[PDB]
Design a binder for these strands. Structure first.
Ligand code: CA
Ligand code: CA
Length: 310
DNA sequence: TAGACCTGGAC
DNA sequence: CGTCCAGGTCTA
């Protein structure tokens, strides 16, 4: 009881709720769907990971999101900590209102969405998001997930251990910008991305002004933020869009990848107007198409289709 | 605008 | 067992 990952049943007194119907959130459709790679369903229906520098286990009932934190002296989460959870899930943003708007302007969205509710965007930490996706280029969720964990185990601060799992906080810029980081990352299997991580860490601290420069992007415009991001090695148009969408508060950002193309072609008979294949210009066009169709929160809209495809 | 590219399940 | 493919990016 006192050990291992908790469950709602095992330690009732250590949990606290946040009103939240499954219609507004589905942990199982959000946490493992390629937004964040830090959560694992350690026991059925319970998800554990690092959120706001601490470890949490989350699980949900029909109307409640149950939370528990592992900071000593175990106790339920405090209202402020819970606030950190609400912020992470952007619970002030109402999915029902978004699904409704999207559905009214797109019959296809209407269909699919009725079977995949509660898909929303996580508000991620800029650093974690930047380097997580630096690792995602030309790669799959399973691998990316492993790489990211190895990364944090090797360069992130040790937080706490549960069962045989040791949680780590995400690596700081300083640690990632350190000597021989690349060589160490290659031994960990990040492939050529190993250089990207190192180079982008150095690029930020040594040529852009450090952490501040990145955080500033949240107040910056989507177009600005996206442009800024693109100078960093390993970060192309797609990765940048993922970051603007998931960390820089750019909900109109639409990351186009092979997934997006297939769906665009199959479900909307979409084809390039202004090349006939996947390239900078055609990708830019596809993103505008979905933006013109769905509106200001097109990015959220695509997540519904992206994490509903299979 | 065509490959070159780390890695490991899936074909 | 060689060939693909994954939330692509980068370069003659
Ligand atoms: Ca591909
Ligand atoms: Ca770049």
């Amino acid at each position: 009881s006192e050990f291992g990952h908790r469950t709602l049943a095992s330690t009732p007194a250590l949990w606290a709720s946040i009103p939240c119907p499954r219609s507004e959130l589905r942990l199982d459709l959000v946490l493992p769907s390629g937004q964040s790679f830090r959560w694992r369903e350690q026991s059925p229906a319970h998800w554990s990971g690092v959120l706001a520098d601490q470890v949490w286990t989350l699980t949900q009932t029909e109307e409640q999101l149950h939370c528990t934190v592992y900071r000593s002296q175990a106790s339920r989460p405090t209202p402020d900590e819970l606030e950190a959870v609400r912020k992470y899930f952007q619970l002030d943003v109402t999915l029902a209102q978004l699904y409704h708007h999207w559905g009214s302007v797109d019959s296809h969205f209407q269909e699919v969405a009725q079977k995949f509710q509660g898909v929303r965007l996580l508000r991620q930490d800029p650093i974690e998001c930047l380097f997580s996706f630096i690792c995602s280029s030309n790669n799959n969720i399973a691998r990316i997930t492993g790489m990211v964990e190895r990364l944090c185990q090797a360069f992130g601060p040790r937080l706490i251990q549960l069962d045989d799992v040791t949680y780590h906080g995400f690596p700081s810029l300083q640690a990632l910008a350190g000597p021989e980081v690349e060589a160490h990352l290659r031994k960990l299997g990040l492939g050529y991305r190993a250089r990207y991580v190192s180079a982008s860490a150095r690029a930020i601290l040594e040529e852009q002004g450090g952490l501040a420069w990145l955080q500033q992007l949240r107040e910056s415009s989507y177009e600005e933020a996206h442009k800024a991001l693109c100078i960093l090695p390993g970060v192309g148009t797609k990765v940048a869009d993922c970051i603007c969408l998931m960390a820089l508060d750019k909900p109109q950002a639409v990351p186009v990848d092979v997934h997006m193309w297939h769906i665009a072609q199959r479900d909307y008979s979409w084809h390039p107007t202004t090349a006939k294949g996947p390239c900078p210009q055609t990708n830019k066009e596809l993103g505008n198409f979905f933006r013109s169709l769905w509106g200001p929160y097109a990015g959220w809209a695509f997540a519904v289709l992206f994490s509903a495809d299979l």
